[PDB]
Design a protein around this nucleic acid. Structure first.
Ligand SMILES: [Mg+2]
Ligand SMILES: [Mg+2]
Ligand SMILES: [Mg+2]
Ligand SMILES: [Mg+2]
Ligand SMILES: [Mg+2]
Ligand SMILES: [Mg+2]
Ligand SMILES: [Mg+2]
Ligand SMILES: [Mg+2]
Ligand SMILES: [Mg+2]
Ligand SMILES: [Mg+2]
Ligand SMILES: [Mg+2]
Ligand SMILES: [Mg+2]
Ligand SMILES: [Mg+2]
Ligand SMILES: [Mg+2]
Ligand SMILES: [Mg+2]
Ligand SMILES: [Mg+2]
Ligand SMILES: [Mg+2]
Ligand SMILES: [Mg+2]
Ligand SMILES: [Mg+2]
Ligand SMILES: [Mg+2]
Ligand SMILES: [Mg+2]
Ligand SMILES: [Mg+2]
Ligand SMILES: [Mg+2]
Ligand SMILES: [Mg+2]
Ligand SMILES: [Mg+2]
Ligand SMILES: [Mg+2]
Ligand SMILES: [Mg+2]
Ligand SMILES: [Mg+2]
Ligand SMILES: [Mg+2]
Ligand SMILES: [Mg+2]
Ligand SMILES: [Mg+2]
Ligand SMILES: [Mg+2]
Ligand SMILES: [Mg+2]
Ligand SMILES: [Mg+2]
Ligand SMILES: [Mg+2]
Ligand SMILES: [Mg+2]
Ligand SMILES: [Mg+2]
Ligand SMILES: [Mg+2]
Ligand SMILES: [Mg+2]
Ligand SMILES: [Mg+2]
Ligand SMILES: [Mg+2]
Ligand SMILES: [Mg+2]
Lengths: 127, 148, 185, 156
RNA sequence: AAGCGUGUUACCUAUACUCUACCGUCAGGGUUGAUAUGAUGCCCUGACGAGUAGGCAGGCGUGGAGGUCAGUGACGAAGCCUAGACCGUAAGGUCGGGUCGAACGGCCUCUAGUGCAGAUCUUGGUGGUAGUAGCAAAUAUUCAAAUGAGAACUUUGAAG
RNA sequence: ACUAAUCGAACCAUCUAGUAGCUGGUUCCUGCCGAAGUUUCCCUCAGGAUAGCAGAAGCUCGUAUCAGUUUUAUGAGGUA
RNA sequence: GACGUAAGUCAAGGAUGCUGGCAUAAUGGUUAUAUGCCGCCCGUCUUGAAACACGGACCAAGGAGUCUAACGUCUAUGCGAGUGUUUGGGUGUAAAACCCAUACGCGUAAUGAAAGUGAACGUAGGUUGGGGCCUCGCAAGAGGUGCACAAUCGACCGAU
RNA sequence: AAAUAUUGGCGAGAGACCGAUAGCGAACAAGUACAGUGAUGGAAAGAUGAAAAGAACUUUGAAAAGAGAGUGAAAAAGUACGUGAAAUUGUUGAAAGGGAAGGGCAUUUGAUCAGACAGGCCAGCAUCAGUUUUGGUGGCA
């Protein structure tokens, strides 16, 4: 368990998808601001998609925390994992995507020996 | 460092900061100093008056070495004595042993009179001197010698 | 809706920190930020603001300029404070014995002060012997003697210096500069 | 390293709560809720049952014994907000109810202690219920809303 | 009258007004004899937030360079696919799984041939149209056998 | 008319990336501020310069100077 | 602040107490669909675009404020009446790094077409403001000195 | 003579250069193939595997080839060969579909999914605080 925290409020969980990225394949969903003179999305006409605004910013006391209440720290090896030895209530370790299968058991075995939560303990796991 | 320019910041904006109406073009007002008497006259008269027309008389084959005469004001005259010997000359402001200051070697043609040298006699050598500069030198007890 | 009389979200327009990354200047600001807050002396607040000033807003103060400030009556025993560079001057021949606190002393300026019996001091040593700026003297250099100021507000009948690369006859001394060639400015 | 490190870490020292100014004052029941009133149970496995209100327990609940001999509702607790207090009344100063409190109804077949207590409690209750006619039938009948029943203008 | 004139109430509901929270911006302040070591930090207080052209600021991403993590990797690097998961308002970052086979990241800085939906943009590839328009000038073909896996169309014979 | 599908001056290469006050396009995010189509001059009227409007950097100071307002007093005006 | 003789208590600078069910897809997220209301196609020029204005069938990759000489304002840095080693020379672990003479450029003097001449009456001036500092004051304040800067009147240098 | 020039030739050493739509037009039988009467114009085109070990043999077919067997670390490497995106397409599966489709806010249903017993999810009551809304009744001018 992590430290107690206020109930995490997102204010917007829906993804901010680019306008007309559902209409043309050449338009990726990565958000882009509409900058056309007549754009209804830019002009904020009713019935159109929302745009990212600073008003959606998350509460600073619950920001960057996963639903487990820990902040995610990406770890590449045992030495990196030690940095969270005194921060087991605030940080959970994630194993990097490019860590070999035999190195992940060393990290996982060390993490249990110190109580660090690992957020992807089932990756590259032999069973 | 191109990463610090507004060009990187204008990426994604249609006109690159140049306007949708103006439409940044090749040479809307001419090239160089085009129209400095016609359609750039206001600017030229406001910021560069005197630009157009002649004034004065010509000098065929002007050599600037003829007009070489760098000016040394009197308040800087003692800088031509080295820092170490300067103090021992101001002390004991003597008449029978006064410093010789050859200002030509220091690279000056004329000696001017911004003034207030201390009352120490000095033998000042120069090509040219103003009227006030010598009288301030002679007031301190020195003298001016003319050299070529 | 609110009918705003003033502009919203307007910055004050004053430096709240130095622009420089000078590590030693940043902890002169740290010392005088503390002194300004914890001491009511107006001197500390003035000094803290002067530490933020850009290079053109803290012109060099000459030793001759220092010597003249010490000739005010009852001001010969004060500590001269310059938030900036103290330069030398060969026009002045006799320099008094005084204490000068400055950010920087040129080699000529430092020699002249020390030789005359005085001492050159940094702004932290000033803070430890004048925690409220006891009997100091804040000197500033001439701000409008800079060459760029000659061309400020150029215009007809303004008497300003034209922005010009080459100087002499044939260079803007003609129509517009004399009655014999059209008009005069 | 995949991530360098947080330059400084948050302190995991948990802060104590500020002193709270929330004093527990006793509940003030509705005026219509006095012991001996017949209650209509609005919710639960005994929905719509007519029960006798006996005592206000210290956990803000009502101790009811809708006489188990009559309608089969034992000595139990109900919430005062899930009952309708009718106007019918019976006398209560014949039943002993100090024995019943929160610890009595604490959890941990039917215990013999509870079965015998029901016999003692309802013994005086049904004796007084026989006084005015049609209570025993009224308490055995279950309340329900009929067509055209508007509880906002109905009285109990 | 569910129309017209007029009058009295009730009611409905804007991104407006009041109150509260949260985000950001601005402003005014607090905080050093361990500031319970981060003073561009922590914190208190009040107000404010529309925006094309345009300005400025803070960041995200890409190729390459100096330093560092004695960083990741043939026990699988990179790339690619993934209505599977997580973080960020966002640019994006991260993880799992599949394919794959040899290199590649974090951070502090340097650098630029550094970010695409348009330009009747360039090159290449691919659609619907669509099994569609069509394969109709020059009179004309037919029977049998042979060959052959297969004959309107080849060969021979016969006819026209 | 014709001069190799080219003719009111062929075709090929170069000068040449010719010039264009004209047309089209001009590629990441968020935050804060935020306009002008008016003045004067110009072979000027699809363009410029100029002043204005806008941003940024701030600087000297610290409640003044002030003010798209009123009042009092005192002028001016030749419209209804 | 309140109540209480005190002790203390309180609804007085922001929610606590008691109780129950579940402990998993139940809540929640994502996604597909359905329903209610709303939602015209972007980009562009334009006073005005969903336009019966223009470009766009689709997709990938490429694709447009750059470099340089000279310069203005601002900022950072070094030194500072100076400053600039790198044209050259010395040296070298060799296009690096390190070291250096004489010049030269800009600055330290202006003004006149030019011949020329060339910057202190004075505490480098007077007046009015002016931060800061000093003295006397518990303080308000008074007095002294007053850098930068602002206005003004003078003095000085060149031209007339 | 030297100090000077040198997008040609010959030989060297290098790069914060480009990395097969880039870099010379040309990384390859490139000034080639091809077009033009001619002067001239002028491309596209790199990558199996460490090694051909490049699939003996059986079967079906006229054959191409298929199905097996085999080689190989891998045939999800078969000379139509590293990886193998998108447009576009086939099959399977899911879903919806009265003259478009796609989108926003909210929830139903279906599918799918992350985390937590050393308090996590959802609620009920009481006493308060802040902001409101709607009643009942009292005393006064
Ligand atoms: Mg999100
Ligand atoms: Mg998003
Ligand atoms: Mg518009
Ligand atoms: Mg344009
Ligand atoms: Mg009416
Ligand atoms: Mg805004
Ligand atoms: Mg814009
Ligand atoms: Mg390794
Ligand atoms: Mg991989
Ligand atoms: Mg997909
Ligand atoms: Mg290989
Ligand atoms: Mg480019
Ligand atoms: Mg494209
Ligand atoms: Mg675009
Ligand atoms: Mg096209
Ligand atoms: Mg047909
Ligand atoms: Mg012809
Ligand atoms: Mg051309
Ligand atoms: Mg605004
Ligand atoms: Mg004309
Ligand atoms: Mg136009
Ligand atoms: Mg403005
Ligand atoms: Mg009249
Ligand atoms: Mg009139
Ligand atoms: Mg659902
Ligand atoms: Mg609609
Ligand atoms: Mg029009
Ligand atoms: Mg439009
Ligand atoms: Mg048309
Ligand atoms: Mg057009
Ligand atoms: Mg078209
Ligand atoms: Mg691209
Ligand atoms: Mg004169
Ligand atoms: Mg090529
Ligand atoms: Mg290939
Ligand atoms: Mg493989
Ligand atoms: Mg494959
Ligand atoms: Mg392969
Ligand atoms: Mg392949
Ligand atoms: Mg596809
Ligand atoms: Mg819908
Ligand atoms: Mg309340």
């Amino acid at each position: 368990a992590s430290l107690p925290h206020p109930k995490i409020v997102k204010k917007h969980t829906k993804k901010f998808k680019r306008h007309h990225s559902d209409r043309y394949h050449r338009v990726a969903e990565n958000w882009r601001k509409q900058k056309g003179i007549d754009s209804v999305v830019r002009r904020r006409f009713r019935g159109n998609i929302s745009q990212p605004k600073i008003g959606y910013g998350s509460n600073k006391k619950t920001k960057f925390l996963s639903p487990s209440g820990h902040k995610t720290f990406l770890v590449a090896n045992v030495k990196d994992l030690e940095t969270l030895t005194m921060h087991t209530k605030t940080y959970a370790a994630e194993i990097a995507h490019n860590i070999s299968a035999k190195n992940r058991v060393v990290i996982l075995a060390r993490a249990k020996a110190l109580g660090i939560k690992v957020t992807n303990p089932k990756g590259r796991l032999a069973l | 460092p191109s990463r610090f320019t507004k060009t990187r910041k204008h990426r994604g904006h249609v006109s690159a900061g140049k306007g949708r109406i103006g439409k940044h073009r090749k040479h809307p007002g001419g090239r160089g100093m085009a129209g400095g008497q016609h359609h750039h006259r206001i600017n030229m008269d406001k910021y560069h008056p005197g630009y157009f027309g002649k004034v004065g008389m010509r000098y065929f084959h002007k050599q600037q070495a003829h007009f070489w005469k760098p000016v040394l004001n009197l308040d800087k005259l003692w800088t031509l004595i080295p820092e170490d010997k300067r103090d021992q000359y101001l002390k004991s402001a003597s008449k029978e042993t006064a410093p010789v200051i050859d200002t030509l070697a220091a690279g000056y043609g004329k000696i001017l009179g911004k003034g207030r040298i201390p009352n120490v006699p000095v033998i000042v050598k120069a090509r040219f001197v103003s009227k006030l500069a010598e009288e301030k030198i002679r007031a301190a007890g020195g003298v001016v010698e003319l050299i070529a | 809706g609110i009918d705003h009389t003033s502009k919203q979200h307007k910055r004050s327009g004053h430096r709240t920190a130095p622009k420089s990354d000078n590590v030693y200047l940043k902890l002169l600001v740290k010392l005088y930020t503390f002194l300004a807050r914890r001491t009511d002396a107006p001197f500390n607040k003035v000094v803290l603001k002067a530490l933020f000033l850009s290079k053109i807003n803290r012109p060099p103060v000459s030793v001759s300029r220092i010597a003249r400030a010490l000739k005010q009556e009852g001001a010969a025993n004060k500590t001269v404070v310059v938030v900036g560079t103290v330069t030398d001057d060969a026009r002045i021949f006799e320099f008094p014995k005084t204490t000068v606190a400055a950010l920087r002393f040129t080699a000529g300026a430092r020699a002249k002060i020390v030789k005359a019996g005085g001492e050159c001091i940094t702004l932290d040593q000033l803070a430890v012997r004048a925690p409220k700026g006891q009997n100091t003297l804040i000197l500033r250099g001439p701000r409008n003697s800079r060459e760029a100021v000659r061309h400020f507000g150029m215009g007809p009948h303004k008497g300003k210096a034209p922005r010009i690369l080459s100087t002499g006859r044939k260079f803007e001394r003609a129509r517009g500069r004399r009655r014999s060639k059209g008009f005069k400015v | 390293s995949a991530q360098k490190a947080p330059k400084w870490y948050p302190s995991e020292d948990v802060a104590a709560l500020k002193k709270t100014r929330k004093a527990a004052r006793p509940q003030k029941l509705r005026a219509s809720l006095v012991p001996g009133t017949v209650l209509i149970l609005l919710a639960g496995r005994f929905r719509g049952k007519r029960v006798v209100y006996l005592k206000h327990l210290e956990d803000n609940t009502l101790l009811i014994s809708g006489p188990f001999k009559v309608n089969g509702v034992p000595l139990r607790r109900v919430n005062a907000r899930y009952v309708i207090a009718t106007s019918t009344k019976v006398s209560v100063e014949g039943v002993n109810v100090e024995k019943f409190n929160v610890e009595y109804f604490a959890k941990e077949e039917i215990k013999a202690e509870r079965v015998e207590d029901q016999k003692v409690v309802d013994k005086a209750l049904i004796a007084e219920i026989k006084k005015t006619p049609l209570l025993k039938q009224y308490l055995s009948a279950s309340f329900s809303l009929k067509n055209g029943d508007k509880p906002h203008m109905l009285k109990f």
